[PDB]
Design a protein around this ligand. Sequence first.
Ligand SMILES: OC[C@H]1O[C@H](OC[C@H]2O[C@H](OC[C@H]3O[C@H](O[C@]4(CO)O[C@H](CO)[C@@H](O)[C@H]4O)[C@H](O)[C@@H](O)[C@@H]3O)[C@@H](O)[C@H](O)[C@H]2O)[C@H](O)[C@@H](O)[C@H]1O
Ligand SMILES: [Ca+2]
Ligand SMILES: [Ca+2]
Ligand SMILES: [Ca+2]
Ligand SMILES: [Ca+2]
Ligand SMILES: [Ca+2]
Length: 671
Amino acid sequence: AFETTTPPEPPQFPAEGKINYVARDTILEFKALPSYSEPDWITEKFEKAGKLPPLKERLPEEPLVYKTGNMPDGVGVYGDTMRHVVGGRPEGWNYIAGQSQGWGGIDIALSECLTRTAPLFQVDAKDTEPLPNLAKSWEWSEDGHTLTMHLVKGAKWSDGEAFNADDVMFYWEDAVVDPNVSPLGGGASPEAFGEGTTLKKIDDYTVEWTFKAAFPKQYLYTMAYPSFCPGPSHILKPQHPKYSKNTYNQFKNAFPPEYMNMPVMGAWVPVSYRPDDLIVLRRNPYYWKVDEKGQQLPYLNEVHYKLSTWADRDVQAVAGSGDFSNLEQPENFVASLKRAADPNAPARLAFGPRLIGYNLQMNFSANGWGNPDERGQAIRELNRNEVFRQAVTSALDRKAIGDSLVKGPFTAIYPGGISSGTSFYDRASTVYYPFNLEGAKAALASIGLKDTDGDGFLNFPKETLGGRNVEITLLVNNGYATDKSLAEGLVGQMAKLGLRVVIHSLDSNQRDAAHYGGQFDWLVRRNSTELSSVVQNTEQLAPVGPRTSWNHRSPEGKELDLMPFEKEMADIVRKFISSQDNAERADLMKQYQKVYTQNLYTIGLTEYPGALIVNKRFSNVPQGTPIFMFNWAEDAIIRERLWVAADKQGKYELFPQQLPGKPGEGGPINH
Ligand SMILES: OC[C@H]1O[C@H](OC[C@H]2O[C@H](OC[C@H]3O[C@H](O[C@]4(CO)O[C@H](CO)[C@@H](O)[C@H]4O)[C@H](O)[C@@H](O)[C@@H]3O)[C@@H](O)[C@H](O)[C@H]2O)[C@H](O)[C@@H](O)[C@H]1O
Ligand SMILES: [Ca+2]
Ligand SMILES: [Ca+2]
Ligand SMILES: [Ca+2]
Ligand SMILES: [Ca+2]
Ligand SMILES: [Ca+2]
């Protein structure tokens, strides 16, 4: 019906950053050091004044020790503030109940996981085991169905309470398993860990996973951010409906933004908050990570999250008032590159591979996800028709989509699927539907879509919705110029095709709620880690479970109304997860890409590289760090390991020589 080909090779993109590829165990280890150290004011103004227990006590028996060999600039010194600028707003501190803290690094910093994957951009292999984090070690039984997992022994919460299997178990049973709780990120359903996966407590520092599959090693990546971030059980358990008189909404909102010093396993603790202004975090005294020389991390004493816009993060990182940006909006590229062109610029800018992608996602549930009306249901039915999808992708002039964001060598013709920047990507396996408006018009006419009332907009046949003009509801994020630009352009291209598209502009919190709830026909969405890395949240590549897919979920409780190609992709993804052979895995992903792009699981909008922007005074920033691969750069750069030379240090501390107070109190502690 259409003359499909493979996508054209994008312009050669050098002016990048090269990664220094290292072995997995070059970064950290767990061991006891002969002696430990911390900032002198802690020992002098807090420990000597009674206010805090000595360092050796508040640390695990074997802390997480960062190795100097992997440190880009070596061991650091204490001091300074890391100033972030975010476009998000805090909902509260209950991460495990699906509350957002404002993004742009704050939840990443606060919610430490069993494993860690973002620093893996620098590891040579893609068969690589995620790094040990809160789970210090793990072993597989001979059969490969049981995974014993050992936790950090002797670690404490920012408040002094012990960290144990009870906090790990509280998350599994009362957040993941509990059908009434939805952890942050939207992908923490029990099936994300495998259909039929069980987990049980062995002792205070040992847990045991039981998997249906033999060695589904890919699930260790799911135990990283955002899917397995345990919360303080001693604080959250008395507020949980299963253990109290609170509703699930009462539990979700039990710790609002005004509640200070929320127990965390993270490097910094929230000590101050002003609505639509700022969140201040001070170093966690009970932090369980050290360098090889015994200095307790983080090196940085303070973190700021300025509550602004995502565009203002770029503005501020190049102005020098903000210390970090993920330059990801092509509308912002030229302005930022001009400022970066000055040798006196306070920040450095480095582009990486093309890993930022946008897809048009069509809701494929005809079995009632998001409780559709007659108009909604008729769109679900068009969405599931392969001819309708083929015409929609053919009506898109992808060179015009790319130019509308930024001219030059940034954008690449993106038809959907695995990003062109990933090693798993095969151009020969990617189905490209070139721009063909006339063929697309004819394709829609072949499925009964004709303009009957002469207003230049295609009507359903009289047997469907009374023969009224087709109207599609497109869900978009308010927070970004790119999402808005893409949404408007799409409406314009669909108009030339004869289809009437109505924009549904929502703020990030409401958008995510409307997405995961199924209350959408179509949606503009920036790709998550599975299309940028494959190995991170692999379960999200296909509808392997009832809530794993972003565009095809089933209502609670009902079976998945899978189309044949979805069943094919799910078989390809399940095979990949349990595969131990690398060549098999590489071919499974050529197979996957082919079924995806030919059948149009999603419809690609565009793809381009982003740039990491970091203030020049920071040391230990890894060379060629991507803005997004296994996670966002905020996690990948290992912020608790960043430092500033004493002679280059800023004077930005709003609570100098202060520590976090007790949870629920006013804020920090002096004097
Ligand atoms: O946090 C660092 C980041 O902040 C800004 O982007 C944040 C983004 O927030 C909302 O994201 C929810 C997102 O959740 C899911 O995506 C993943 C995969 O599970 O979950 C993690 C984040 O929770 C990531 O590692 C993702 O790979 C889900 O798949 C998806 O539908 C949701 O959109 C989102 O609503 C909103 O667009 C943003 O505000 C910032 O832009 C980044 O540069 C970076 O600093
Ligand atoms: Ca070393
Ligand atoms: Ca080096
Ligand atoms: Ca200091
Ligand atoms: Ca927490
Ligand atoms: Ca009409």
